[PDB]
Design a protein around this motif. Structure first.
Motif, PDB file in Angstrom:
ATOM      1  N   UNK A   1       0.867  -1.206   0.000  1.00  0.00           N
ATOM      2  CA  UNK A   1       0.000   0.000   0.000  1.00  0.00           C
ATOM      3  C   UNK A   1       0.892   1.241   0.000  1.00  0.00           C
ATOM      4  N   UNK A   2       1.915   1.227   0.851  1.00  0.00           N
ATOM      5  CA  UNK A   2       2.727   2.451   1.149  1.00  0.00           C
ATOM      6  C   UNK A   2       3.868   2.609   0.134  1.00  0.00           C
TER       7      UNK A   2
ATOM      8  N   UNK B   1       9.237   4.272   3.246  1.00  0.00           N
ATOM      9  CA  UNK B   1       9.149   3.372   2.055  1.00  0.00           C
ATOM     10  C   UNK B   1      10.456   2.574   1.907  1.00  0.00           C
ATOM     11  N   UNK B   2      11.566   3.035   2.496  1.00  0.00           N
ATOM     12  CA  UNK B   2      12.815   2.233   2.649  1.00  0.00           C
ATOM     13  C   UNK B   2      12.525   1.054   3.585  1.00  0.00           C
ATOM     14  N   UNK B   3      11.919   1.330   4.746  1.00  0.00           N
ATOM     15  CA  UNK B   3      11.598   0.332   5.803  1.00  0.00           C
ATOM     16  C   UNK B   3      10.465  -0.586   5.332  1.00  0.00           C
ATOM     17  N   UNK B   4       9.527  -0.069   4.531  1.00  0.00           N
ATOM     18  CA  UNK B   4       8.420  -0.849   3.929  1.00  0.00           C
ATOM     19  C   UNK B   4       8.995  -1.863   2.935  1.00  0.00           C
ATOM     20  N   UNK B   5       9.644  -1.383   1.866  1.00  0.00           N
ATOM     21  CA  UNK B   5      10.289  -2.217   0.809  1.00  0.00           C
ATOM     22  C   UNK B   5      11.072  -3.364   1.452  1.00  0.00           C
ATOM     23  N   UNK B   6      11.897  -3.035   2.450  1.00  0.00           N
ATOM     24  CA  UNK B   6      12.856  -3.966   3.098  1.00  0.00           C
ATOM     25  C   UNK B   6      12.109  -5.211   3.583  1.00  0.00           C
ATOM     26  N   UNK B   7      11.054  -5.029   4.382  1.00  0.00           N
ATOM     27  CA  UNK B   7      10.245  -6.143   4.953  1.00  0.00           C
ATOM     28  C   UNK B   7       9.428  -6.811   3.839  1.00  0.00           C
ATOM     29  N   UNK B   8       8.878  -6.016   2.919  1.00  0.00           N
ATOM     30  CA  UNK B   8       8.105  -6.481   1.732  1.00  0.00           C
ATOM     31  C   UNK B   8       8.976  -7.382   0.842  1.00  0.00           C
ATOM     32  N   UNK B   9      10.294  -7.145   0.794  1.00  0.00           N
ATOM     33  CA  UNK B   9      11.265  -7.916  -0.029  1.00  0.00           C
ATOM     34  C   UNK B   9      11.726  -9.174   0.721  1.00  0.00           C
TER      35      UNK B   9
ATOM     36  N   UNK C   1       3.407   6.254  -2.687  1.00  0.00           N
ATOM     37  CA  UNK C   1       4.651   6.962  -3.094  1.00  0.00           C
ATOM     38  C   UNK C   1       5.137   6.477  -4.470  1.00  0.00           C
ATOM     39  N   UNK C   2       4.302   5.729  -5.203  1.00  0.00           N
ATOM     40  CA  UNK C   2       4.425   5.472  -6.653  1.00  0.00           C
ATOM     41  C   UNK C   2       5.679   4.701  -7.036  1.00  0.00           C
ATOM     42  N   UNK C   3       5.977   3.606  -6.329  1.00  0.00           N
ATOM     43  CA  UNK C   3       7.074   2.659  -6.673  1.00  0.00           C
ATOM     44  C   UNK C   3       6.515   1.431  -7.403  1.00  0.00           C
ATOM     45  N   UNK C   4       5.185   1.296  -7.502  1.00  0.00           N
ATOM     46  CA  UNK C   4       4.502   0.120  -8.114  1.00  0.00           C
ATOM     47  C   UNK C   4       3.431   0.519  -9.142  1.00  0.00           C
TER      48      UNK C   4
END
Lengths: 199, 138, 251, 109, 190, 176
Positions: A190-191, B111-119, A195-198
């Motif tokens: 979602x987040x 979004x750094x901390x989001x991506x990290x766990x999402x990956x 912020x438009x990365x997807x």
RNA sequence: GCGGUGCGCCGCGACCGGCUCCGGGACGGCUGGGAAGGCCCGGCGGGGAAGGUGGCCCGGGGGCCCCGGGUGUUACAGCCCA
RNA sequence: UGGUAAGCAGAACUGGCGCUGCGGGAUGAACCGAACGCCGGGUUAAGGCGCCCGAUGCCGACGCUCAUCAGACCCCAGAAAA
RNA sequence: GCGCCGGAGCCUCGGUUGGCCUCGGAUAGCCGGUCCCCCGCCGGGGUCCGGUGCGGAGAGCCCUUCGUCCCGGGAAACGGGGCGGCCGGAAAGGGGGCCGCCCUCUCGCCCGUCACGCACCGCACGUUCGUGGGGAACCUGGCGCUAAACCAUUCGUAGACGAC
């Protein structure tokens, strides 16, 4: 910090002008697959052009005189050489940063190699304007190792195909492993999307 | 083999120039390389515009070549191009690019901390999907 | 102004660099082109110019004025005792030319070959291939020798065999034998390398390489004549007797 | 922890063709390739950091070998994101194509 | 100027089924498949109608010499279709004054031995292109029937056994000897 | 005249100054396609001196306003009558353009005359500009845009912005 | 404490003035008292043709929907003029 | 003005070079811009701005041209009739 | 008295300050899937499905790092961390990926708790690669290695002299 450029379907001087300027700004440029580099105007003009270069030799002792390098690599090396202050130390310290290859050897066969779209034949020539291959031009003027380069190039195309078949095979097991898990990577996805990365 | 054609009433995305990031509708073709264009509902005034700055979309809408702004505005709002644009994947990744550029320094941390766990949670499952690829050959 | 009377140019510019040959033994610059149809064979040998004598044979060429008449032809005797194969070298085919991939020498190398690896044989303890020899009589070495042959019948394309002359059997003063890479031209690389490994520490006589009434290319160093003037070296015209500063030079 | 300076290349001096003015240097800051983008970097402090043989005193530390010539980005050179900089010592030509550190230390954001 | 559009339809017969991968057309029908690539020419090859009964070649914004290439593609695909419905037959005839030219075929049609041309001892072995079958026909004193699908190949190999039989260092107006292309037709007729 | 940028059309009226013999001299109007009013007033005197016994000394300019477009959002067909000097002789031409603006067609004419005949704007005298109806427009390069059902693609989209990466990792696409 | 002078060396900031090169706002004048254009409903009336809309006729593309001609003044689009 | 012409010979006017650096014309006594104390900032001229080489790495505008001898910038450094 | 493997430092040369591990390539055409027939030993050809101003995007992706303690909620248990092997790699051969264990934790990753660590008092060469490259020696434990070249003499296939 090392540009690996592909030579396939690039224009000879157009690429040289962009390599020479990077190399003067302390950038280690590897130009790879120089038989792929192509020259504008029909073949027979460029053959004549290079044959007229061979004829230029120091009358009294040709062993001193202009060294007529045959390899597509060493042709490309020399046209970059002609766009450098190669009599000064900064222009000699430059050329050493430039590293030129026929085909694509070890270090730069298993590396993603860039493209220069302002030096690229499809972008920069009209599709009715004829061109020459620096592979063929080199072969028909004394370069011996065209078919050796071509068989060793055909080998690694099959070897790099196996890698891509395997790289697709992960990407499917990524896209499927995203589809399984979307219930518990929901608040993270979602987040990335706000912020438009997807999106 | 071509699908998009410069036609009277084709909506075209304006890539760059004064009206960069807007939809103009081709009213009349002026020249070899220039078209009379109007975007009455996207605030682009009736004006000449070269083909080099416009990326033509898959929205054609019916009005005549001579038609004045009133009758381009009608066919636009009738078709409802401004919503059909925002629905399109083209326009969804335009606003993604916008959002990414406007990403604050604190918004970038989140979004750094989001991506990290999402990956991590995928790369677990990629490893588990691939043990099922090994197990079924033994 | 122009050359008044046109004469052709004295001497060839082909062999321009008229210097002492850096090698004493004639290098084979080019071996014959191999086709994998043929059976395996050595393509070169290494002989010694013994001398020169007459022959008398009856010529057999129809139409000539010497048809079914005897001639007297000059012949050379090249003494060619059988050469001992003492190694095999593989060559990988590369875009920078042709690179030596891997050499494997034989277990027992004869002191004729050993002498080649020393400038002063008298002063030497003759240690060459004494730690290499140990690879052939342990299990852990035989393994990695057979993985060199396995590696070489995969990548390498040009197989050459190392054969040295059997110098003891000649009347000459010297004992230091002449080593030489002789290209094996034959079938597939696999067959070529199984065959050369089979010939490792074997005599190759000259009948196994050459046959009678065969046109062959002889490679050697010319008979050396020292520092020579242009009249001897280039066979230019001798100048007139009244020349002041010498009549034996180019004007 | 992280890098607090932007990667600039000392491309050369402010020159004509047959005259160079060593007092002004021409920086090539990585990423900025237009006069538009180089508005951020005007007035920013920039260091030619190098290291020599002899240990020179280091402010806020013990003597290292590393030295500096402190400069200032003065204005936009040319049309394509090049920038003029002016240093308290004219930079040595040793550093043509080498790294200088355009800092964000004179901030305006 | 730039012509906005020039285009031309090939009305293909029902016996033939043409398809195209990009602008490399394939033509198959009664007597084989012919392929000719047009990667050089830079046109829009479109195949329209159900059961694909016509090929349509467009050239957008073509200058005079690029409009010339529209009909030349159309003419190749017409020649590719004649070469598959009907085939190509080049009935060509040996003319001689005194010395009869002994034409004998080897290699089940692939190679022609030409003997006794101006009473020459040199025998001329002229090969055909891959997919051309030369023969000697019946109730004809002097005749070579060349037969193949691809007009390009049949005609090129007809020119080979004509330029092989060239009279050197003589008046070619008195010396009318050689094997000349006498008739361009089709193997099985309309 | 240097045909600098997009031209403007100027209505320049001017009269020979009032002599005792000629207290009320006639006024002469012209259509001067010039970069600006300062060179429009020069080109006025060039033409009026070739047509009348009238110099800037024996005359004055009475009005020099730009004539604006009374349909700048309608595409029209302009037939321009030329008089240009070649390298060998002077030549009359009729020339057809398709612009929104009269001045722009005459601008488009000066560029074209340079392109095709190497005529510099000093050589060229424009003697007549006229907006024409489609059915009265002979040159075929202009007629091919008299199509209600006009339909062409943009086939080979040679990408510009060739130095935005300068080093990319993808061969660019030219089928859009 | 004040006035004057200096810093051992290396640095930083602040405001003021000079000269600069830029940037962003906002205000007004002039014109053919700008030209076009937007919106009122293309206002009641009459008018013209075309890069000719629909309708109609013709040619065949698709499972009745779509195009290529022909006719022609508003129609199941608009356009120019008075 | 003489001379077929000449980087030839001879005059008129003005400006140069000589006596003069400097930017540009790759290179030049004279061409083009501009004349000079020693410096910092700013800005230009004439020329330029793929790379050498500072500057177009503008999503510059419209054409024209394919040469198996392309063409490419005052003086200026190579061509005509056809 | 030197080669391979395993503390305390001296100089000297400096540049650098996260990685991208790879289809081929087309350009008037692509890319990814795909179930269905076909040939192929799982590789191709179709089919259909999407995507195509490339979002399975280099307008890209990966790594993202004040550190520690206590205690929760997700995430993980097919994980993480170092010991014996299995299985890979010539154009200028490399740091990979696997199953098995002796194996150590239930710490790491994402939130939220508990607060602590020179808080050096506004300030510069900070933060990396880096136990870098090169040259000397100082200690130390294994595993080991015992050469040759040149001169002189000799030859004469060589030779001005060297060289050969």
């Amino acid at each position: 910090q090392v540009l690996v450029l592909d030579g396939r379907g690039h224009l000879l001087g157009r690429l040289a002008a962009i390599v020479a300027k990077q190399v003067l700004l302390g950038r280690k440029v590897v130009v790879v697959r120089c038989e792929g580099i192509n020259i504008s105007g029909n073949f027979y003009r460029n053959k004549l052009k290079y044959l007229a270069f061979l004829r230029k030799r120091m009358n009294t002792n040709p062993s001193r005189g202009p060294y007529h390098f045959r390899a597509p690599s060493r042709i490309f090396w020399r046209t970059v050489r002609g766009m450098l202050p190669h009599k000064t130390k900064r222009g000699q310290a430059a050329l050493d940063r430039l590293k030129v290859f026929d085909g694509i050897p070890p270090p730069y066969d298993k590396k993603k190699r860039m493209v220069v779209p302002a030096a690229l034949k499809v972008v920069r020539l009209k599709p009715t304007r004829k061109f020459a291959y620096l592979g063929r031009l080199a072969h028909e003027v004394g370069w011996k190792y065209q078919a050796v380069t071509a068989t060793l190039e055909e080998k690694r195309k099959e070897k790099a195909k196996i890698h891509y078949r395997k790289k697709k095979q992960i990407m499917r097991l990524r896209k499927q492993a995203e589809k399984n898990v979307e219930k518990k990577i929901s608040k993270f996805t979602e987040v990335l999307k706000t912020h438009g990365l997807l999106v | 083999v071509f699908r998009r054609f410069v036609e009277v009433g084709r909506v075209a995305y304006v890539s760059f120039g004064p009206h960069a990031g807007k939809l103009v509708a081709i009213v009349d073709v002026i020249d070899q390389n220039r078209a009379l264009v109007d975007g009455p509902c996207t605030r682009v005034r009736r004006q000449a515009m070269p083909f080099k700055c416009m990326q033509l979309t898959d929205f054609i809408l019916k009005f005549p070549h001579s038609a004045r702004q009133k009758y381009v505005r009608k066919a636009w709002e009738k078709a409802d191009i401004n919503t059909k644009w925002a629905a399109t994947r083209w326009a969804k990744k335009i606003e993604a690019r916008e959002r990414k550029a406007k990403m604050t320094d604190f918004d970038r941390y989140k979004v750094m901390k989001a991506k990290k766990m999402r990956n991590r949670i995928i790369k677990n499952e990629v490893k588990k999907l691939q043990r099922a690829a090994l197990l079924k050959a033994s | 102004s122009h050359r008044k009377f046109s004469a052709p140019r004295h001497g060839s510019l082909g062999f321009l660099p008229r210097k002492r040959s850096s090698r004493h033994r004639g290098k084979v610059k080019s071996f014959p082109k191999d086709d994998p149809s043929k059976p395996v064979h050595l393509t070169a040998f290494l002989g010694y110019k013994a001398g020169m004598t007459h022959i008398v044979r009856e010529v057999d060429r129809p139409g000539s004025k010497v048809n079914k008449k005897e001639v007297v032809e000059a012949v050379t005797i090249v003494e060619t005792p059988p050469m001992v194969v003492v190694g095999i070298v593989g060559y990988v085919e590369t875009p920078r030319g042709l690179r030596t991939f891997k050499t494997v020498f034989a277990e027992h190398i004869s002191d004729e070959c050993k002498r080649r690896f020393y400038k002063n044989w008298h002063k030497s303890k003759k240690k060459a291939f004494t730690k290499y020899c140990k690879k052939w009589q342990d299990d852990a070495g035989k393994r990695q020798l057979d993985k060199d042959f396995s590696s070489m019948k995969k990548y390498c394309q040009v197989i050459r065999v190392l054969a040295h002359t059997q110098m003891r059997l000649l009347p000459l003063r010297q004992k230091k034998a002449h080593l030489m890479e002789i290209q094996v031209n034959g079938g597939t690389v696999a067959e070529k390398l199984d065959w050369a490994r089979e010939r490792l520490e074997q005599q190759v006589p000259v009948s196994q390489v050459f046959g009678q009434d065969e046109m062959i290319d002889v490679i050697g160093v010319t008979k050396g004549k020292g520092y020579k003037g242009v009249t001897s070296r280039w066979h230019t015209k001798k100048l007139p007797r009244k020349t002041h500063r010498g009549l034996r030079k180019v004007a | 922890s992280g890098r607090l300076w932007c990667k600039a290349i000392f491309a050369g001096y402010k020159r004509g063709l047959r005259n160079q003015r060593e007092h002004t240097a021409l920086l090539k800051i990585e990423g900025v390739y237009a006069r538009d983008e180089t508005e951020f970097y005007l007035g920013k402090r920039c260091a030619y950091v190098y290291k020599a043989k002899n240990n020179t005193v280091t402010p806020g530390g013990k003597p290292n070998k590393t030295r500096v010539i402190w400069g200032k980005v003065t204005r936009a050179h040319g049309n394509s994101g090049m920038v003029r900089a002016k240093f308290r010592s004219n930079l040595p030509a040793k550093a043509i194509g080498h790294r200088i550190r355009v800092m964000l230390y004179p901030s305006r954001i | 100027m730039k012509t906005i559009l020039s285009n031309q339809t090939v009305d293909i017969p029902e016996n033939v089924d043409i398809s195209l991968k990009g602008r490399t057309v394939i033509v198959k029908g009664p007597r084989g498949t012919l392929r000719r690539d047009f990667n050089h020419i830079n046109v829009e090859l479109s195949l329209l109608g159900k059961k694909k009964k016509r090929l349509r070649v467009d050239k957008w914004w073509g200058n005079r010499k690029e409009l010339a290439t529209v009909r030349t593609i159309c003419s190749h695909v017409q020649n590719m279709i004649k070469g598959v419905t009907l085939g190509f037959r080049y009935k060509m005839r040996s003319v001689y004054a005194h010395f009869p030219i002994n034409v004998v075929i080897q290699e089940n049609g692939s190679l022609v031995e030409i003997r006794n041309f101006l009473g020459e001892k040199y025998i001329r072995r002229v090969r055909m292109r891959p997919g051309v079958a030369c023969s000697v026909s019946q109730a004809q004193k002097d005749e070579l029937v060349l037969e193949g699908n691809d007009i390009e190949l049949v005609s090129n190999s007809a020119a080979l056994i004509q330029q092989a039989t060239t009279v050197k260092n003589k008046d070619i107006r008195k010396f009318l000897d050689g094997i000349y292309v006498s008739e361009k037709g089709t193997v099985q007729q309309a | 005249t240097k045909a600098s940028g997009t031209l403007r059309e100027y209505k320049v009226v001017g009269r020979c100054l009032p002599t005792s013999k000629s207290p009320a001299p006639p006024l002469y109007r012209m259509r001067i396609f010039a970069p600006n009013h300062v060179v429009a007033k020069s080109r006025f005197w060039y033409f009026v001196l070739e047509l009348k016994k009238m110099k800037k000394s024996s005359g004055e300019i009475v009005y020099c306003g730009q004539v604006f477009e009374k349909s700048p959002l309608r595409v029209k067909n302009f037939g321009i009558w030329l008089r240009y000097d070649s390298r060998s002789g002077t030549h009359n031409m009729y020339h057809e353009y398709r612009d929104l603006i009269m001045a722009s067609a005459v601008t488009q004419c000066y560029r074209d005359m340079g392109a095709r005949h190497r005529a510099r704007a000093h050589s060229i005298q424009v003697m007549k500009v006229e907006e024409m109806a489609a059915a009265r427009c002979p040159r075929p390069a202009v007629k091919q845009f008299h199509d209600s059902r006009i339909r062409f693609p943009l086939p080979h989209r040679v990408l510009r912005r060739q130095h935005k990466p300068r080093f990319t990792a993808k061969r660019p696409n030219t089928f859009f």
